[PDB]
Design a protein around this ligand. Structure first.
Ligand SMILES: [Cl-]
Ligand SMILES: [Cl-]
Ligand SMILES: [Cl-]
Ligand SMILES: [Cl-]
Ligand SMILES: [Cl-]
Ligand SMILES: [Cl-]
Ligand SMILES: [Cl-]
Ligand SMILES: [Cl-]
Ligand SMILES: [Cu+2]
Ligand SMILES: [Cu+2]
Ligand SMILES: [Cu+2]
Ligand SMILES: [Cu+2]
Ligand SMILES: [Zn+2]
Ligand SMILES: [Zn+2]
Ligand SMILES: [Zn+2]
Ligand SMILES: [Zn+2]
Ligand SMILES: [Zn+2]
Ligand SMILES: [Zn+2]
Ligand SMILES: [Zn+2]
Ligand SMILES: [Zn+2]
Lengths: 213, 210, 210, 213, 217, 211, 217, 211
């Protein structure tokens, strides 16, 4: 009498071990020495949006962070050491050259962001505390498309929130410095597993000659 | 350039998976009910979906530096607490597995940093300080053990600390007591290509009321 | 005045106890080996030695506001951690009982204070914030319950939170796993003159290593 | 098959309930309404020194704090909220009129204070961290009685440390204010359960006319 | 002056004001009647205190057009309420109260401040009360120039540093949250300029900033 | 870009109308500057000192900031201002420092309306204009009951007197005054009425006795 | 002066110094030769700036005896590195560097500062630039006196407050850790004094501080 | 108590030798004070101004502090100093403010030896004497190579000039100087050589033109 879950784990790793790990001694021979991913990714915890899947990332390719609604809070050593550490490690230690915040269709996190009043009353332990990061995004979307159906509405808010997060990335000095030296780039993505579509946008950043006389 | 890597890669998944399983994703798109919640490190070399061959819809994944789970704190650790509260009380997962791994950069730091009042990072030390109880233990039970050994002990014991922290969340304890939730610790050694798993038992029983 | 209260009182104990048990204290004076470690509130109305009729040498007692046990933190909670580490690893106690009690001033505060960023005390709120997970739970499961009820739920659930915090100490977990240590929560209701006790089960078991 | 410990607890409370609680309905009838102890006591956790015993304190008499080596750390909201809260509650909420720090013979805490090097190397998780509060006391005693036998030595250090703690009480504004308004008094005690003796000293504090011309 | 002394400076000031009054103020009653009520400059300019580079003249700015900050080496330090409040107050007032739409930082040829930045060792010893303390804001630009053009002749170093310093200031404008919100909201644009009065030229550049989709496959 | 264009246009106009038509002048200015004036003036877009006093290139070393304020000597907090005074006074060796205030100054308006009671509602503005608190205190003590508009005019002028006082906290400023190589003046430009007032400051030190 | 003007103030200063030089300095070569090398005053004194209460005269203090602080109402504010650094620097220098053994705070009769403390409302409105701000240090003493002697006549209020203020300052000396360590180590003693120049009297009191056994039964 | 005794003795001596022997004088002083001087002097036990300048009761309103420093006007940080100047100048209406520095001043020695490089090793001393940084900067620039003892003398005198400059940041001080109802002077007492130097400060404002 075994644990279904435990077994499910065992059989999964076994599959990985023989089909992947073993059939690629070259790869894991190096990966065992260190990592050097060019990407750092923020994706939702949501079971349906594994980043390694949707974008077919191979091992050693992307340093990943997954949290409720793929939110990137602003720089704060007392309230957001978790996020700050991942960003600081990825950008300054692994030297990623890209940061991508990926939002997705039907996000329960975003949906709660829209549904919660944020009028000083909380019905959750941490959820509201955490989704508040996207309030700006919610204000914008709600003010702009105030009469848009919730279904549509959420879609707008899922996308805006990525920009908000992107906006928050700029509160980190080492992120800004990365953009200045052009050793870093920031991008936003949107996965709609319903229509099975993907949208990718980015941040234009750099100086440009205007004229000389 | 990298924007292409991103298109091609998504195109691959589009045809090779999203399509080749219309009845699959056609269902996923309708909602989610994963039985697992996984805590794994952000290291690009240990994507849980790769290491445990998870399929979309199976696990709600939280990935952070050194796969740490801080104790209950609404002021300092909302990120974590939010995921736990969501997976447990909303998605209704049945398991929470904290997976540590060999050659963890996060744990390596925890080991080198002195935590004597001086900090040389903006966030890194603040974060991995969560694992200090594990560092304290290992250094007291395996102080004269080779560094490589120390790291493994700390990585595994760090998982244990995180399992203990999971027990500071009322709704995690409640789910354990109702046997609707199970806690597990894992350890992936991508060097020797091995994997360990262990279970945690937590229960409460009334003794008497005079 | 009060200096007298102190002399007379000590004189009483001198003859009425210290002497009337020469073979008793003659032994105590040689060392201590208490089987219990008790966490009870500083309230003058609940001295554990009175409520559970403990005799000198039976229990290593830690008394603080609202009998709270914060999680492992060498920077903010050395007082607690030191007592636990001493009782567990040095005196070798077998049990750790956290005793909450009715009409707890400490818990009452925890309930009234908003913990919304504003503080009106120097230490009081900082301290009882430890019990927030308990406040969160009770307010979500018994929000429309009469205040008196709420307090009792919070007092008992605060004990549970503290039991969970005890599990963030590696050496407490280790002792539990070796079955050399047991965790218990108690609740003294000096109003109706009743007492509850409950036990906590914690264990770890290996599952597999491929 | 019952738990010895559990049973020991049950029988203890039962004894209390019938012999004490019941045979004093007057007392607990009031005590159930609130408390108002005139004392606040700092005693060692040590099983052999229950304050309620040694000084025969009755319920409602003393607000107690027990910790390793009955140490009173100085005012610090980040490192010592535990101590600060007890002192703040006792002094400002219960209005105690006395604070007594009681040291005792053969204190493992003090003994460790003396035995530990405190040279930047720690062999404990919290013990050394916590007993350091008494370093001043240790310096004094050690410098003064450097050649005193450890047995004797410890005794000196157990007593000095109380003064150190007493010294730390003065770092709390509300304690100082209490002494200024004379609504509070500070005392030190030493219990020697070996010879079964008790020493009580206090803090002289107040203004006194010197002369008028 | 028949024995009575005269202050050249006071007289110069009086002559100048009367000239402005006659040739400009009095000849533009519409303009000045409107400016008397408020200002809505579309530009905020940072230029050097140097007496040869008055933005008014060089870019022909008219009264009401440019909210101007002038200091040694036209430097923009990073956000610091304790050390750089004058700079921060100017940007905060311009961006949030006057709602300017452009912030232009202009460096120039033969800048004495940039020359000091390059001439000073910044080796732990100072020989000025404030000059070194201030131009240290440009150390990062000095480093870049020293690395990229380490063998170049001093004068060439200066020109390079004068321009790179402008870039370092633009970088520092990004440490101001209200500036970032402006770029994000597309209500603000940042620009760098360079005035060579030796040759008689002006170079202008800008900061590209903004989201732009790459694909929706 | 409408803005880059405005900038493009402006320079070309300067180039042919001023620059190319004064080769002798720009030829000497290319070699260095020796302006007789250092001028502090508000950043306000309506009070450019070049225009108001018709200063020509090479005549005035200019500092412009919010409310034309001069903080007292402080290498830790007011390096920007100190660095300009030091450069002007010791290196370019200006002979005059003129602090010019003006009608309807927003900085002074803020100074007069902010409470300065512990709470701040700005990130830097209040912090900066606090420099003017002594002028606010004087005005309120002597004209406290006056309508706000008058209080603004009084405060704008006293704030210049406060800055002149702060210049005297720079040792090299005191020394130039003592040596008669430097002069200090305050100015007030009213762009509503279209007027200008100038006043001078006298400062000296004299040995009395040594016994 | 035959037409040449003379400064009374400068002359008063010169006359006074020459007098001190002749009658004191020159007549105490031993004393002054020793003071020229260092000072070791056993007292630190706080007295009012009031021109009528110079501690030198009133307590006949000789040069080298008392490190003195004089300010409005002889007030000792509590420890504050940001608001009260002058007071803190004097106590720190006296206690830790000069190692004085006594700190004496002396109040006095008809103190203008204490009169203002009592006359001012402290109702949210100020009418002074600094006077109210400073004497607010004595608000606690004003409260005590107003409570204990609320019906007394104004003058009586002042005398009470002048003395109580001294006590509030003694209380504030206790907010200084180095002062507390001194009392504890018995290397420092605190005293309050009161000088009535109307009647011609002096009252002195001290702070009792120290551990003292009660029993060893 | 040896100390209370010393204090007891001293007063009685004052009582019969000065107080009782000058009934006319103390009788008027009991009615109020109108000292023509306000004096800032060091707290140092060797430089009591009453002794050094032989000031009699009723002649000088005195402020004594570490290094006889006068910070600039700041109601938030330097209320103690500001309150004394305001009382002396506006209420007692003193006619002179004299700032007196002295040989071998410990405060100046600290000023010259502390680094003021971000780290402090005192709780208040460095904080307070930083007021003198401009004098330290001047001295180092003009006498930087001098032996420490000379640097101390130079800095002690320039520190008085710095305080005189800070007095000019009090509006009511500028106004008394302008109105000729107040005079400012610096002094230096050398108790090693036994000498005294006095110097005066001249300050004024004059209307130049209004057009
Ligand atoms: Cl976070
Ligand atoms: Cl977190
Ligand atoms: Cl604690
Ligand atoms: Cl504590
Ligand atoms: Cl600045
Ligand atoms: Cl500045
Ligand atoms: Cl002060
Ligand atoms: Cl002050
Ligand atoms: Cu993944
Ligand atoms: Cu007890
Ligand atoms: Cu201009
Ligand atoms: Cu004196
Ligand atoms: Zn989602
Ligand atoms: Zn890792
Ligand atoms: Zn309680
Ligand atoms: Zn003990
Ligand atoms: Zn320049
Ligand atoms: Zn203005
Ligand atoms: Zn007085
Ligand atoms: Zn001195």
């Amino acid at each position: 009498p075994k644990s279904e879950a435990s077994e499910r784990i065992k059989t999964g790793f076994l599959h990985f071990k023989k089909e992947k790990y073993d059939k690629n001694p070259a790869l894991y021979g190096e990966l065992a020495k260190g990592q050097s991913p060019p990407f750092m990714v923020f994706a939702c915890s949501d079971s349906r949006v594994c980043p390694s899947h949707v974008l077919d990332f191979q091992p050693g390719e992307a340093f990943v962070v997954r949290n409720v609604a793929n939110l990137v809070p602003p720089y704060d050593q007392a309230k957001y050491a978790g996020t700050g550490a991942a960003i600081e490690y990825a950008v300054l230690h692994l030297k990623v050259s890209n940061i991508v915040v990926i939002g997705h269709s039907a996000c329960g996190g975003i949906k709660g962001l829209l549904s919660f009043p944020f009028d000083g009353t909380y019905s959750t332990d941490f959820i509201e505390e955490w989704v508040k990061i996207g309030l700006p995004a919610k204000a914008k979307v709600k003010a702009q498309h105030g009469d848009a159906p919730f279904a549509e509405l959420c879609t707008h808010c899922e996308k805006e929130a990525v920009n908000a997060s992107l906006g928050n990335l700029l509160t980190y000095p080492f992120v800004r410095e990365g953009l200045v030296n052009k050793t870093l780039a920031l991008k936003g993505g949107y996965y709609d597993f319903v229509k099975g579509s993907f949208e990718l946008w980015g941040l234009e950043f750099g100086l440009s000659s205007t004229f000389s006389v």
